[PDB]
Design a protein around this ligand. Structure first.
Ligand SMILES: CN1[C@@H](O)c2ccccc2[C@@H]1O
Lengths: 237, 300
């Protein structure tokens, strides 16, 4: 059934699985019209489809043209997400198809189940985890490729860069979730922590700074501190 | 005016005939039910005084043969049987009527309740849902499972209701996923009405039969089927206007007849709230919405 704190190790076993997050598919700026009414203007979005074991990110860019002349866009977005995920599974060779797809939001369950009726062996699962994948658009190179897209586009990334050379997928996923939780809670503070020390660069083929093992411990520490402080301010605790 | 004579009543039992029922004592001189209106299906049903788990009965049509009830002390139930000897049957019924040992089907002349609940129900469709081809009458009880329920364990004793599944390839055209899931008109009109039922009369008959099996036997699978067939119409944007008019009448009489003390287990909150207040047809069931609001406001 639901993916939760209890069954957390299952993410790193040898059954191919994908997380699907739809939080950045349908994105709008709300503005005033000349007549003093409110209107939305869509901007480019993305489906965040992630193999938590390998770090492979299938970033499907949702170009604003998708929404042209369509009604009930927040509902369409869920079905569009399901159509793209099902297109992605059908495009993969059988031995690369996921055995499970975990949706970060329960509203994605029916749209994905209906789009995946051809795949009765692929389990569609919710999670009890509050995953910070919404902060994917706080990663500069992901934000950049989305905003520049002039048409629908699939871009392939490894969201772990080269970390799996040195750490396990459990540790790589905990680092990713810590970075994304920080970026989500206080984006300015989190980005300051990551890009202050100028000697440290992001390689052309990477998303995150090239940190030595010791520099990662220091960064991780600064991210936790950022997250706990903002929790204090939040709940006056 | 036909008759279902009884050999005897050797065990104390509540006997149902359609929407009526009476208590018979162990070895009470009871020899059956007379003045049964011709032209409709009927159901005779049984709840033993000792074991209210024995809840079961027979769908029958008196035009199709001469039916009687005899208690079987081996299988421990009241059994429907057909008497092929027309003259022996008339002779037995004449005696029992002369000795006034038969209760009279207690129909009020003004009262169209049974017609209204069974308008579309036909014995030939019942016998395809309940397969026992050697009999002209159909046994149902509280425990019988549906073909659909058994897919999720004895095929011979199953209720063969039409499988409805909103998250099935049958229900969803490839490339029409959101459209067909959010608007079930294609599934209702093309797959079910044109494809499987052939017409709305057969659809309504199955819906009405599912309700009656739910109400008279507390058959859970029948109740699932009744709600599924309501929900498939209500979740369709495009329904013939006569079907909507007729559905409103059907549901009105079902809700009218339901015992007040069973609405908690026989009515699905989600389906009714969706059908009356959210669905495409939320404004198409005036009679049904008014009786539900006045009779079961807590449910909604
Ligand atoms: C032999 N059985 C049938 O002829 C019959 C028909 C009506 C009533 C009772 C009976 C009897 O038990």
């Amino acid at each position: 059934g639901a993916m939760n704190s209890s069954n957390y190790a299952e993410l790193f076993n040898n059954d191919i699985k994908l997380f699907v997050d739809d939080t950045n598919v349908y994105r709008v700026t709300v503005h005033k019209t000349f007549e003093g009414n409110v209107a939305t203007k869509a901007i480019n979005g993305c489906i965040f489809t992630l193999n938590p074991k390998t770090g492979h990110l299938f970033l499907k860019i949702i170009h604003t043209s998708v929404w042209a002349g369509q009604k009930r866009l927040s509902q369409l977005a869920k079905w569009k997400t399901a159509e793209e995920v099902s297109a992605l599974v059908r495009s993969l060779p059988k031995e690369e198809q996921p055995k499970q797809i975990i949706v970060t939001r329960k509203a994605m369950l029916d749209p994905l189940e209906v789009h995946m009726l051809d795949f009765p062996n692929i389990a569609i699962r919710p999670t009890e985890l509050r995953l910070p994948f919404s902060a994917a658009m706080s990663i500069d190179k992901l934000s950049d490729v989305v905003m520049k897209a002039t048409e629908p586009q699939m871009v392939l990334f490894n969201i772990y860069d080269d970390w799996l050379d040195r750490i396990s997928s459990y540790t790589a996923f905990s680092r990713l979730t810590l970075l994304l939780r920080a970026l989500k809670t206080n984006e300015e503070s989190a980005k300051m922590i990551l890009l202050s020390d100028p000697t440290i660069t992001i390689k052309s083929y990477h998303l995150w700074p090239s940190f030595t093992d010791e520099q990662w411990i220091t960064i991780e520490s600064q991210m936790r501190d950022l997250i706990l402080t903002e929790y204090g301010r939040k709940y006056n605790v | 005016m036909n008759t279902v004579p009884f050999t005897s009543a050797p065990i104390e039992v509540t006997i149902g005939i359609d929407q009526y029922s009476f208590n018979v004592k162990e070895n009470q001189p009871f020899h059956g039910i007379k003045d049964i209106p011709i032209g409709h299906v009927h159901v005779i049903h049984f709840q033993h005084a000792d074991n209210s788990s024995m809840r079961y009965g027979y769908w029958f049509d008196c035009r199709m043969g001469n039916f009687y009830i005899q208690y079987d002390p081996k299988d421990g139930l009241y059994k429907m049987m057909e008497e092929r000897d027309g003259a022996k049957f008339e002779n037995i019924v004449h005696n029992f009527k002369e000795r006034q040992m038969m209760v009279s089907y207690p129909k009020i002349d003004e009262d169209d309740t049974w017609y209204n609940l069974t308008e579309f129900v036909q014995m030939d469709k019942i016998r395809k849902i309940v397969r026992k081809d050697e009999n002209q009458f159909s046994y149902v009880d509280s425990s019988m499972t549906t073909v659909q329920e058994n897919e999720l364990s004895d095929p011979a004793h199953s209720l063969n209701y039409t499988v409805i599944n909103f998250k099935s390839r049958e229900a969803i055209r490839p490339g029409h996923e959101m459209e067909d899931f959010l608007d079930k008109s294609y599934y209702l009109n093309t797959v079910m009405l044109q494809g499987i039922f052939k017409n709305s009369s057969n659809y309504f008959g199955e819906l009405q039969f599912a309700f009656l099996n739910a109400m008279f036997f507390g058959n859970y699978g029948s109740s699932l089927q009744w709600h599924a067939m309501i929900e498939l119409i209500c979740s369709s944007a495009t329904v013939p206007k006569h079907m909507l008019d007729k559905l409103d009448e059907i549901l009105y009489y079902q809700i009218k007849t339901l015992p007040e003390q069973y609405s908690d287990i026989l009515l699905n909150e989600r389906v009714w709230n969706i059908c009356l207040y959210s669905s495409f047809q939320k404004n198409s069931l005036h009679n049904t919405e008014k009786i539900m609001e006045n009779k079961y406001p807590e449910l909604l």
